Amino acid sequence: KISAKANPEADDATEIAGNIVYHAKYSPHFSPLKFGPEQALYATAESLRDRLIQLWNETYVHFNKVDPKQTYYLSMEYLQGRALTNAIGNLNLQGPYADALRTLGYELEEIAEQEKDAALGNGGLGRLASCFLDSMATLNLPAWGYGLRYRHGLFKQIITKKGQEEIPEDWLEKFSPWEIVRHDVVFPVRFFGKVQVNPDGSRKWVDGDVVQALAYDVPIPGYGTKNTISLRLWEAKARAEDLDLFQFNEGEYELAAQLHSRAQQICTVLYPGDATENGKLLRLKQQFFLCSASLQDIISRFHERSTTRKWSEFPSKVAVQMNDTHPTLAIPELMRLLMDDNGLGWDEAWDVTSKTVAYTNHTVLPEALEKWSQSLMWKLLPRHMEIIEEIDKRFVQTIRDTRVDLEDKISSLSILDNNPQKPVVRMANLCVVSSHTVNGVAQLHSDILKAELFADYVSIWPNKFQNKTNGITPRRWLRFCSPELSDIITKWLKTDKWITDLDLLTGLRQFADNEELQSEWASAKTANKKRLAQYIERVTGVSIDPTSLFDIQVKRIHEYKRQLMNILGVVYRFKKLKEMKPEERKKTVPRTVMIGGKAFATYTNAKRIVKLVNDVGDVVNSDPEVNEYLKVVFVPNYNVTVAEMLIPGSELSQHISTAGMEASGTSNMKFALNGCLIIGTLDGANVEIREEVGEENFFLFGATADQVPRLRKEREDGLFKPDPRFEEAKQFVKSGVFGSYDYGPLLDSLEGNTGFGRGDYFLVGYDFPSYMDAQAKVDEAYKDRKGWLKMSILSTAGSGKFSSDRTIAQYAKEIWNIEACPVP
């Protein structure tokens, strides 16, 4: 019926349908006869990519001409999610694309559901990086991300009757229609080898292995702007020359291909397991490979913008941001590139380096900061060790010169820990010593950093440390995932400028009590809940009641996130329902509980928690007697797509980490922004949300951070007195009512008073009573519909501050010193 007709700039239904069909025909990846959903997606995605290329190229040419200071963000993860809807939306072509697909016999949703998530990351570190990219593009900032092109991600989670099983991700097994290979953009990265000392006394890293880094671009479109930036990803490749024919033809296939294998290894998965020496080396290879490829690419661009250049311009034209310690090696690597490849002296090269690099810490934990064996570092990266050692030797001399009062502390301040048992390189110390700025990711976290963790460094450089509170993008996380709700907002604010000025959401406050608005809000939530119900049946075969309360905990499965507390809470509520007469049951609040997330494969108890949730759900959900009032579901393969289906339908979300353990929590913000109320500890980003939405719209409970040490010491000393409901939940789990699986060894982590891996270190038992009492409040509040709806609107109305646009603007001004560079 419809005719192929290329129109790379199509912007109406007919043009778009012609261009989609053009790509179906003349960019084929399949037999021509069938044009089913999958072929439609790739066709549509190529239609959009025509737009994206035009804009990316314009933006590249513009930054080239203006030669502004440019920021480059280094991260080991990016959670890009699906790109289709975000691209349609930033190009403001929703109506036209939807019409185009219908003329081709498809609903956009249908096609959207075919797309795979780019498995390029894992946690909030990666989603932060991605929301930042969106904000850089929309604020017209000259900034890019650089990452690694992982083939298989961390893993795809399957749920079998044995619990979580891990299988590789396949998002590249056919092809990805977003990315643009650049076969001219290749840089060599070395490993192992040694340092040649030249007769003139210059130095050179030689020998070892050389791999090739190949650039692919993923364009990132901004909202209401031509500016389209890049997430540039690196693939490690061997050259064809590196296959040894002689050995292949001798039948020795692994030796023959061993350079190709070492390359493949680097982009196989995120965070490869590192109990062994091999894995530790592979991790370091990953980190180095990203730093070295990216910095060579950055230096190459610095020179390309020359209009004949002097190095002293470098930190006025470049800013590099290290996200956690993973890209620490950018420090010595930049030093290597300056002194060896470009001939600079130490002092000049260090001045440049120190003013270019800045460091973002995301961790409350003292021992979670990366430390590497000095022995491994010498083996893998000998030139970098020389440089790292000279950095430490000068810094220690500074402390003897300028600060004799810290002499006794040199053995913890220095970068090199020369402990005779486990000598290591302390990477956070290298970051802090070298960067012009260090920031944390929430006001409390940043204060802990200045006061406890990095106290003495704050002392030497009192202007080095800063705060930059995390945020989210309101495009992906409200405008695009919750379009019904966004229309309501635009109607009642009488503008749509909130989509780039999120503080305008405070205008909703005056309407929180308004009956018509609450009625509209109920309907949108009800409609988003039907959809979520649908999805849940589709992906777990469980039929959930849309009129019940939707209570959601989705995040990495970890003892400190206290999924176990949640799930024991559920066991308790279930027991009490079985024990009630039917007349008492009709008075409780029906609830559907939803838990999701992934456990590290080797993390035994995390894997036992996932198993537990499922076993509970099998029994609870199939009990005709109480399944009207309670259901429990494990949502599998939690990722961006899943979050996009859960958040708009959520009513209560649980952010209940042990106080002091979380530096932030951006999912918190997504929930708050979509009118979902929180039950939470006064921890991380909960502190800021609760300030912004108001205490009365938030279910606080649990010990506070300053209290926790004291409460552990009470446990060590036999003074802890457990609540009987806590013990009743445990026993009931041990009674074997949830099947043959012995949960005793899991529950053992909550027994005893002292010793590694027991003694309830995360205060599950202790917070259970105030947790369950906050849950009773949530039940009472939910029965008062007007009050509930009021709280939900004030939740959204207070979410202004949590925009990634605010965060990036702050970074741009105080740290990077970059400014808007709009493409005409």
Next chain:
Amino acid sequence: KISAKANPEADDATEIAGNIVYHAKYSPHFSPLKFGPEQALYATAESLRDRLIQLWNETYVHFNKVDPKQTYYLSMEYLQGRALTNAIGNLNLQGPYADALRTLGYELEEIAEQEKDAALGNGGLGRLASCFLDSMATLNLPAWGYGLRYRHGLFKQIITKKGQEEIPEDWLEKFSPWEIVRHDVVFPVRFFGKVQVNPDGSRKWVDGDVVQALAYDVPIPGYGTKNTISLRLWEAKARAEDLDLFQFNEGEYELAAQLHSRAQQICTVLYPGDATENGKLLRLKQQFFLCSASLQDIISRFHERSTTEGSRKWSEFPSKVAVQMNDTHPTLAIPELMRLLMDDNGLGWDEAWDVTSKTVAYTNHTVLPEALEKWSQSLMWKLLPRHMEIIEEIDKRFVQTIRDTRVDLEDKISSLSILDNNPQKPVVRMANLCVVSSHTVNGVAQLHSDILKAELFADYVSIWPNKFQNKTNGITPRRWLRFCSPELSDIITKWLKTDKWITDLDLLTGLRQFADNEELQSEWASAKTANKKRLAQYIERVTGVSIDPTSLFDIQVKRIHEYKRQLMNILGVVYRFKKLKEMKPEERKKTVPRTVMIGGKAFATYTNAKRIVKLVNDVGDVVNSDPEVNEYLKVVFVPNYNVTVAEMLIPGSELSQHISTAGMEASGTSNMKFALNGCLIIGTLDGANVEIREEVGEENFFLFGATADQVPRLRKEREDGLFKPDPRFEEAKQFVKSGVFGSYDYGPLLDSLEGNTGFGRGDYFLVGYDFPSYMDAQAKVDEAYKDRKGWLKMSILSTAGSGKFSSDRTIAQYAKEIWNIEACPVP
């Protein structure tokens, strides 16, 4: 200045330039700023591929609707060469594309020189298969090729001070703009494992390793027709699921990825080295994988063309399908088709065998009986157990036949049967499996096919006297005259007063009446001269030697092998050099200057072949740098011989050498290319030389050497001490051993020409014996070349006689006598 504008059907300069620029922008593989030659090529190739897709899709739809009998050709090699010029040319868009590129600031030649050869094959077996594809397309026949998508080819040859070194090919390290991946066309292929026997007596191959075969299409356009067929290539892949995360995360990387590694192995190189057991298994994996993937794809298409009820009746299968096995490599298609019919599709043995026997036909390309593939029964059981069961049942029935209807052949059963149950090295004789199973067996030249009926397969000819046939090899006149020699092709069209020869090559005979015409000779001289300048230019570019375009161009290019007698040639050269050093300058001015060019590749493990390449180079270093004789002689080794190289050498050639020991060559298609481009041959009465010489006429050909029937006798004279060597032959040897060509000891190589008996010695290939009649034929060539009119006359009659050597003739014969297929033109 020019704007992107998609026009998938561009057919004039302006439209084409717009579409090329569209692809530079919206199909990028590079940073956007620079639009240099490389980017221009990929951009131009994608413009052409738009046309190619439209025509391929039309052809697929047409064959689907008509449901004709379809031929599928199975080959382990294809020498596709560069595609750019062939595509422009078959679409008849030379003028428009050349103009388009000039508006973009490029000469087409410049861009064409950027393209890499598709390293999908090695020798004449593969180029035959490719020329056949071009002819299938141009005759509008419903036929396809199926092969393997090799990443690294055989190897790229470099020449170092050590001689030949082998490095992997890189033609896929960026990407290939011709091919079309088909992600819905995936079929599973198994290895190892075992046979489950079901209670109902049905059988099923289970367990082992499973790899995925993924189809990529390379469209093949026909000349002056819409018909565009496929070379469908298979890539072996493992699924993502097959990587073991647990092991990867334990640091055990090789185990973790072992299934991916076994898949990458299959498509790494052509003819992987097989001294070891691992290599033998890998070779068999390659062969099986091509047969099983391709047959599944074929069966799927047979069913897809059903218009009816349920599944269509199997008895139609051999009326709708023909499968051609090229050499013994794809023998496994016999038991595999049997496996698919009986196990997956439930047919009984007899019905399945009737189908199978009428579907498959076999082409032999090999004179010697110890080049035909034999495999250890033990390896076959390991790798392909179900196939062994079936192969065994085939042999059990064939032997019973020879008792139930031919009791007179009882005493020969132990050499006729498929299974050789020798107590030391029991093997499966694959040629015997082919001959027992196929409705037709053919050779590739009239003499070769007669040797097959009379010597090699005599007793099989006895049982099935209509089974055996001849099909003389040929070449495509599109790639090999019209497109490589365009100046010359215009002359031909002008004097024949038509251009219909490009698809009716026999019209070339119309040139004969003009062979004595001085205007035509004058035009011919110019065209050769011009082609020779170009060759001279290329040779400097790739060797660093400056050659004289006025000297005689004498070329031997083919696989380096003792039986091809590059060593004879090279010793001839050493002789001529010695004589030139020994002359006074007055005697030198009377000889005919000559540039000798030798090229080809040695199998990496073949010691003497590698020594010969070393020898040629060492001789050239010394000769070419000698001021005293380099005006009169130069010797050059042309590296990395492939289709591109042949395309540069053939149009500029004057004499070419096809001098194999008589009886050893079944054919020789390069012979034909040379003859077709007016290049005269110095050759033995062997393979295709017999036929060329008949066709061009004896007076236009430099024959020499012993004949096939004489060779045994001449070996027996050597074994008995009766051989009396020519003194010029010994003078050449000694001079090579005197160390005038450097420090390399050539004694062990030359040892192959010494002694009278014993494995690897005694001059088995009669180098020494043919040397005098060879060198005398070389003196004739010198005299004939001095008479320019007579030379030009011979060259024209060479071209004028090349009619019979068209691949169009060969494929038409195959279509009628073997496949029983016919023209199916796309409207």
